[PDB]
Symmetry: C4
Subunit: 277 residues, 4 copies
């Protein structure tokens, strides 16, 4: 390795925020989630649940109109911007959000990139995932840009083939976080969290129960919510990745690692988070 340190339980315990008696939901902010399309609807539910579970005050889901009815019965606490991810291709966000995520369940299209460009003119942290991940550069702005690639997405972004990436994961994550001036959460066993200021950590939690469709959609939502309740966005990303993996570890105490469904990570998070308080 390059001796990248693990973000450990001690670090998590020291950095997780309080929800004090005097707070109101405004204290914890409104998040925007731009996710889910008619063709890939479930991602929006997975990210929505992860976000509302993770300490935000309010969530607006800008999903395709036909996806909205699929979310409501499961997550009636979310509100909507009808066809929001499409509308965001055409104009600047008018509303102020605490944090924004774009990409889960979105196609890898130019229109999604147009939406990204408009999202990036906001002054808040922004997460790009999935369909929003492309080979491109980023404008100087206020607020971190957080990319959350699977190794195959990292290849799409950089041209580094997966078989080579996997030999030197932190080295590549660090190099590209620096070059792009973005946070890179390079997924996998020992997920790398590389920051554009050159800080970098490894995540010590998780297991093979996570190697199934949807678990990254859940993670994007987790990061989104934690960006709303942490003052330091670096700590939000680190804690989200950590607690996401910790949920999978709790699952495998009494359940087979073959059998986890992503949404259950959100259902487990309430008890797992308590343990670190």
């Amino acid at each position: 390795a390059m001796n990248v340190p693990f973000w450990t339980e001690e670090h998590v315990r020291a950095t997780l925020p309080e929800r004090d008696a005097e707070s109101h939901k405004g204290t914890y902010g409104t998040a925007l989630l731009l996710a889910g399309s008619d063709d890939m609807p479930g991602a929006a539910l997975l990210a929505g649940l992860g976000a509302m579970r993770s300490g935000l005050g309010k969530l607006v889901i800008g999903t395709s109109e036909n996806v909205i009815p699929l979310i409501v019965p499961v997550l009636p606490e979310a509100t909507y911007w009808r066809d929001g991810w499409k509308k965001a291709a055409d104009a600047q966000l008018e509303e102020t959000y605490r944090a924004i995520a774009i990409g889960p369940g979105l196609p890898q299209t130019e229109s999604v990139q147009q939406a990204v460009d408009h999202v990036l003119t906001a002054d808040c942290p922004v997460i790009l995932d999935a369909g929003a991940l492309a080979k491109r550069t980023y404008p100087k702005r206020e607020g971190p840009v957080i990319l959350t690639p699977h190794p195959g997405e990292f290849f799409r972004m950089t041209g580094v083939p997966v078989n080579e990436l996997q030999k030197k994961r932190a080295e590549y994550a660090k190099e590209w976080a620096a070059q792009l001036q973005t946070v890179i959460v390079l997924k996998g066993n020992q997920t790398v969290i590389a920051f554009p200021d050159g800080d970098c950590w490894l995540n010590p939690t998780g297991n093979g129960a996570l190697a199934k469709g949807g678990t990254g959609d859940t993670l994007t939502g987790m990061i989104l919510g934690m960006l709303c309740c942490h003052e330091d966005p670096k700590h939000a990303v680190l804690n989200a990745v950590y607690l996401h993996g910790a949920c999978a570890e709790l699952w495998t105490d009494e359940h087979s690692a073959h059998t986890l469904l992503a949404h259950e990570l959100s259902d487990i998070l309430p008890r797992v988070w308590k343990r670190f308080e």
Copy 2:
């Protein structure tokens, strides 16, 4: 303070109603919930669940047609008045209800105010929340009118800015309950329950887990149901606010306060209510 007393556990225990062996659902009344729009559907599910959980006999949900399918799989016990909140703008209620709530998930429009005006000609308690909260006066009628503003809604109603309101919450709640001749449930930590006869209490339960979208929608439903099973509507409002907060406190025994979803308050209420019996 003004030494406003807390509505304590002792008061709750002394005032919660029995559901005796000889009762039928008619004993507990039919409630009407005018809530949920295509743009804000989840509020109707949240309030519906809170209402059916809270001791009513039957619930009619007057929600937008497209919202009905989103409620049914979760709350198949509810019945419907298709587009009821819209229809209520145009004519008097023909049916007799035990209690009525209007506003969760409704827009802040003149048409919603027209619906309010028609709701107020019924002889039963009425709850106004959310979109139904405006700067206006109320007609002399039979049955209490119960307003449930968040501080921002209170500002909309009165012109008292939130930063000033928060310095003297009970004083302002009492003054405006008197002026409007309505019950005011002024939300927040230490929620104020101010009555138009000058009685006023503070609620001692709850915590920051409640500072998230949807929890007030759940509360409106709780108050609606409790108005159906309490003979004294004052006690219904007080017990609803109390038990709502108590559910959040049970949650935080083994779950992080960051992670509560409003609908879970309704799922917790069955066991919490038992404890006070």
Copy 3:
């Protein structure tokens, strides 16, 4: 009273059927449930769940087309006869069913009565509930006809006002079961189960948690399923009514009687039924 005996735990234990190792789902029959309309959809979900929980082999739900999508995510084990309750107004059932129920969530219309007339030409037990309950007579047929009126429905059927009915419930139930030559399950505390052969029992289970919308829809489904797995339809009706009430009693051990939702009765039935085996 008239000293009508209670159908006791001892009777239930002696009459509940086995599900032996050598059985196949055909042994337990296909039930037809004609229930749910666009205006009252939830009844079909409630009765569907109660029926599939109660020992049948297969369930066909003949509900309105727009109701089908509301059932599937909750009860994916059911199959459908699209617009079946409407189609049944126009022709004889072609398929053979083990048992049929009609009425939950159906309007009190002539077309529903036409459907009833066609249902009654089948040779199997038939349950009429809700919208299918009217002032009418019944044709001599093979298989019992089981009416499940609430006292208000009994008034509609017979002209006996509810305040008079309630003074002499068994006497009236027996008289009308005899006159109509139908089973009458006259609902309420101490539900009466009156048979056209003059046998009559009282149900000893249940409590005020049941005095809420939907619980009778659940019961109709329970009776439907139990008619499929009991050889003796009398025992099916008696056991269904008993175990339905027993579920409410289990609920109130740790939950307030004000807070039960009907569908939960079906969720409780698996464990309650085990106790009587």
Copy 4:
């Protein structure tokens, strides 16, 4: 008998795969499920849940367009091929899958057979169930073909009447697995798993709780998922059938065998599978 051996717990324990720390979801493959039609939608949800529960990496559900919204809220981890089972009638699969299942909730039509013919040109294991089961032969190909008939389906396939089949189940299953050169999972108590190479086993698990609509749909999904995580497809089929039955046995420890709903088998599988690890 013919002394066909039971696939025992010892065999299951020796053959169930690990999900190691270094794995990614690609290791576990993408499955295709061609299931569910407007008329029989629930089968697709049941098989989808069983498949995602059973160790695959990703699931694509090729179901009718109107069925997709019914799956998403329950199984947001699945992705879709809109009208896939219909489209498969018209062209070869372009995408590579680890395993494919076709038939649950599909009609017994020529178009479904056309889809089968195209599925069979893939090089992967394929499961045919329900509507995909017909009297026909199979082309020489790479990858096993796995037929999962109920006795009535076996009759449809072979002309052997059910009353005769049931007297000599293994003998008939073996003879027809050989003749067709397919795996035959002949369902029932003591389900027969007959292989075209002449190997044959009996399944020792399960009980009458399984004799209800939907449980076979769940099984098809289980086999589909296990084909993705086992290197040996024979062991996948055997373990799926075994663990499916084991879930029903866990259910009946504290719940009546009359009351199981198929989807619950998938909910039980996580804990049951752990026990065999």
